[PDB]
Design a protein around this ligand. Structure first.
Ligand code: SF4
Ligand code: SF4
Lengths: 611, 611
């Protein structure tokens, strides 16, 4: 076997047992890695488990591209049954831990059980130990990684959780290298529930490559193509922050809990403003187009800015000064909580306060109040911090505020306001893990323009475009696993991927093979949700928030415009037709058989009727 | 088996293999623990090795008293073939590592081999790992322990080496809890030679004891006997520092490389001065008479003062301000170098400089110059610092200054100047590990008074006294292994010891059994020296420094007086007569047989003729 090790590191925190599981080359070829491998593991090992119980499996899954010098191939997938959504949950982050896990001889790391006290997992090739982290517990993510490196050396990959993870904030994430984050659906809370403070990894092994020279050649070509792309200069300057102006121009910038798609103060929180306050730039392993832009916040502290962070903690909160939004951003990284769900939870509180629903709490534009709430959420201080720490779905159940609860499947909607964007609304509605733009950022195509540089339509071809994008963004890139931005942003040819894959693994994958592996992952993931939800499931699970159907844009040429539910419903049926799912969004028996998921049928039938 | 576990933790840094060695209860009964067990291990496993080579064995040996709540029972022996003397070397320190090692299920820890890069050993009960210490290398002992606890928590025992150990200073030691030190004969250099930066230990097991109720009863009585002793109040005030005035009054205070036994500025570095500058008091585990007296030095830094540190870095260097001596003391602790050998080496340089033998270097009374040289020794910076880092024996050979090289067997003489004290000179001459007062502080008995509160003689009875004290101090207390101070200083009855040993192990030891066990250890150690010296050995190996014969006291009523060679030689023969050793200081065959050391005979016969 080349590329894949066929090895998965297993750590049981309850028993202290550490072992290496060998999985068949057939499974590796069939699921490829990252999310695929994770979905296979969770389907088999997390049936009916409580997300915060010792039985949940915390998975760190790499893929064949990882550990090797592949173009922006320093990504890693973190997965577990989600404490926020109750379904399959995952996330991705660039981190040296990805390079080291693979160079240490493993394709993935699976943590089960729960330690008796705070501990961290140490991995140096074949030497794996569960060590006491009593001294680290309570420290920020930044401080935890800094201290671990002060002991073991700079040459290690470190994954940590901060107080939000330790306190089981439902959208707590895993942090690496002060800025890289993974696991919006609460991977950080699953990590915290096991009393797992960090993971330190070092690898030195040579990963067996089927064609060393092709690999080295293809990689050099791709790097050069990136360096020579016309978008490279502007990408180097603004990175994802170029989307603030682009979204504002197109009425897609979430403003005041998604109330409007335009923000009057977007310029003072945009990419140009960011350029003027940038002090450093860093990136993920093996990437020659770094986009981790670091600024100084209002308190003079370094903060790494990404578009989503700014959109959800800036315009979405009615906060118009980038230096202030940057303080909130830093807090999220330090505490280890998702900037998106954090911002949407805060915005939800702000709307409830302005409406008189909540007697106390911050209002839109209130930076000091937003900062205090962010901190109270991470430390679960007071009734408000505790409520908001649960996310908008849970919070809305308690407050009767479902009308303005911006989420899909319990996962908070990200940085694109879709009052007039049917395809993007469908992307959020059908995202495998819950509302996220990860799997299909189709709004650009719907508009005809993109950040590096209108008539509302429900054409069934939009459902086809979303499935196509999900195959690449929610499948391929989450399985390799590698950054999708070189392709998305600078236009690196997708042809490099199946070639790099054969050069590495020696297996020839055609685009249809890849499209099929991605579809298998999608149906398996959906199957997981259906099974864990005990068959209680229908098409409404794939609907975007009610706000986009009952309210419209508040300003500009498109004022009053919104989504037509009837037409959205028809577009959803088209999505199901293309995926081979029934009108409830559940995979059909024939579809499962065709995707080599026969094993799913018996289990799903114990819970509902299949078609 | 009670008391002893009969288990030794084994760590091979070259191969990375960790295993547990079981040894018979008969060996445990025979050698008891600590130095006894260490001597057994070195005899069998450090045969013909280079002290700084991977084959040398670094031993951390505890005894049956350790890990249990025994009066001042938190001591630990650190042993290995010495890079300073070439013979058997060991030292002792109080440390929570002692409590933890034994509660983790081990009687001792033996480290062999050499790591490719800096590492530290982590022990938590049965979970043992070799971890990267690449970020730690180069840090002071204080900072190393502090950082390790910032990761693993406060409930651990830690042993570290500082830059002096890393740089292989010949008298580098192992440090714990910013003040406790062990291994004057270079144990820190052996540790540094293996690229072992630290040992972190945690133990939670219940150590099996034969009679828990009697152990509890005896310990409470002993603790109360200490509290209620007439010497307790003055001890709590001055600790070992009371010896500065006592030695000065009796012309035993090493002054200017032992040139005199009287120092004109002794009051300014004495116990009363120490009391006026004490800011804290620390101690070893399970001790109710803590003696780690912490003062602020001339630089406002904390420094724990012990008599020897002050005598050898103060009066011995012509430095009369305690705050300045405390700066040197702190450097010795931070760097991890023996204060005694450091001071004697610096003192040697000062005399050579003032005699014009050395053209560059500090002179007596030169604090600034002494500080710079101490730092240069730790970092092996320059010709002078590298030379002094070798110790006086090696340094004297190069400079041809043997006439004033104060050492015995290559270990520098400690804090008692013996121009007029034959028994104490015999104590230094016959000390099992080289010049040290550890095994027999007979000078107090020789004069008739003690710090806690004369006509020179060579009576044969003085050799008997030295043997008796060696049995207790170099044997019993190094085997239990427990602090000898409660007995020496406040008069704790020695009768508690055999009784406590019985309550713990279930085995009865009469005083004759203990004397025999101690004599067995003394002959096995002497046999190790002879064998490692390839048979090149004679009575002059047990001679005190030449200066005590060729010069006399420079002050007071005893001005001009010194030791007589012929008379000392007869006293030494009396010592051998009592020990059953021949006129070359080598154990006789019948003595070895009597002490159950038959196995030693064949090995000694390959290098010399036995009697
Ligand atoms: S483009 Fe940005 S997110 Fe992608 S690998 Fe490079 S630094 Fe990481
Ligand atoms: S008397 Fe001093 S050296 Fe002995 S155990 Fe107590 S604190 Fe340690």
């Amino acid at each position: 076997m080349y590329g894949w090790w066929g090895r998965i590191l297993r750590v049981n925190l309850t028993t202290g047992e550490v072992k290496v599981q060998e999985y068949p080359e057939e499974v590796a070829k069939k699921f490829i890695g990252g999310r695929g491998l994770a979905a296979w593991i969770l389907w088999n090992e997390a049936r009916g488990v409580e997300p915060l119980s010792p039985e949940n499996k915390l998975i760190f899954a790499a893929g064949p591209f990882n550990g090797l010098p592949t173009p922006s191939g320093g990504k890693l997938v973190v997965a577990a049954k989600s404490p926020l959504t109750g379904g399959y949950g995952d996330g991705n982050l660039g981190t040296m831990a990805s390079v080291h896990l693979r160079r240490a001889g493993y394709d993935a790391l699976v943590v089960e059980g729960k330690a008796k006290k705070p501990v961290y997992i140490y991995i140096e090739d074949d030497n794996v130990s569960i060590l006491s982290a009593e001294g680290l517990w309570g420290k920020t993510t930044f401080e935890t990684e800094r201290e671990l490196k002060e002991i073991h050396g700079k040459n290690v990959g470190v994954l940590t959780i901060g107080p939000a993870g330790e306190n089981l904030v439902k959208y707590a994430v895993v942090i690496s290298q002060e800025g890289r984050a993974a696991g919006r659906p609460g991977m950080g809370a699953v990590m915290g529930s096991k009393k797992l403070k960090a993971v330190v990894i070092r690898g030195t092994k040579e990963i067996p490559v089927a064609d060393k020279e092709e690999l080295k050649k293809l990689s050099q070509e791709a790097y050069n193509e990136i360096l020579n792309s016309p978008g490279y200069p502007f990408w180097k300057r603004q990175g994802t922050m170029a989307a603030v102006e682009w979204c504002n121009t197109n009425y897609a910038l979430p403003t005041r809990n998604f109330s409007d798609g335009y923000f009057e103060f977007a310029r003072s929180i945009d990419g140009y403003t960011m350029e003027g306050m940038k002090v450093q730039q860093r990136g993920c392993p093996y990437c020659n187009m770094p986009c981790g832009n670091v600024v100084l916040d209002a308190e003079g502290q370094e903060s790494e800015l990404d578009y989503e962070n700014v959109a959800l903690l800036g315009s979405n909160l009615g906060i118009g000064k980038l230096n202030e939004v940057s303080v909130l951003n830093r807090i999220a990284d330090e505490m280890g909580m998702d900037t998106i769900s954090l911002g949407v939870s805060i915005a939800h509180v702000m709307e409830a306060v302005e409406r008189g629903i909540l007697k106390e709490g911050p209002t839109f534009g209130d930076f000091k109040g937003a900062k205090q709430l962010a901190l109270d959420i991470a430390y679960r201080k007071g009734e408000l911090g505790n409520l908001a720490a649960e996310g908008v779905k849970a919070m809305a159940e308690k407050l009767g505020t479902h009308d303005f609860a911006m989420h899909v499947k319990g996962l908070e909607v990200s940085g694109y306001n879709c009052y007039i964007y049917p395809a993007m609304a469908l992307a959020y509605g059908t995202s495998a893990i819950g509302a996220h733009h990860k799997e299909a950022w189709v709004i650009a195509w719907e508009i005809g323009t993109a950040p590096i540089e209108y008539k509302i339509s429900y054409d069934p071809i939009k459902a086809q475009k979303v499935v196509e994008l999900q195959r690449l963004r929610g499948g391929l890139f989450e399985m390799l696993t590698a950054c999708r931005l070189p392709w998305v942003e600078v236009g690196l040819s997708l042809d490099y991927y199946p070639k790099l894959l054969k050069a590495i693994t020696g297996v020839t994958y055609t685009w249809d093979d890849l499209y099929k592996a991605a579809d298998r992952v999608y149906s398996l993931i959906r199957a997981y949700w259906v099974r864990e939800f005990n068959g209680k499931w229908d098409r409404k699970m794939d609907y975007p928030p009610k706000r986009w159907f009952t309210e419209g844009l508040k300003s500009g040429p498109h004022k009053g415009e919104h989504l037509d539910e009837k037409k959205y419903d028809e577009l959803l049926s088209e999505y199901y037709r293309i995926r081979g799912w029934d009108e409830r969004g559940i995979p059909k028996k024939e579809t499962l058989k065709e995707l080599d998921l026969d094993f799913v049928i018996p289990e799903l039938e114990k819970v509902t009727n299949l078609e």
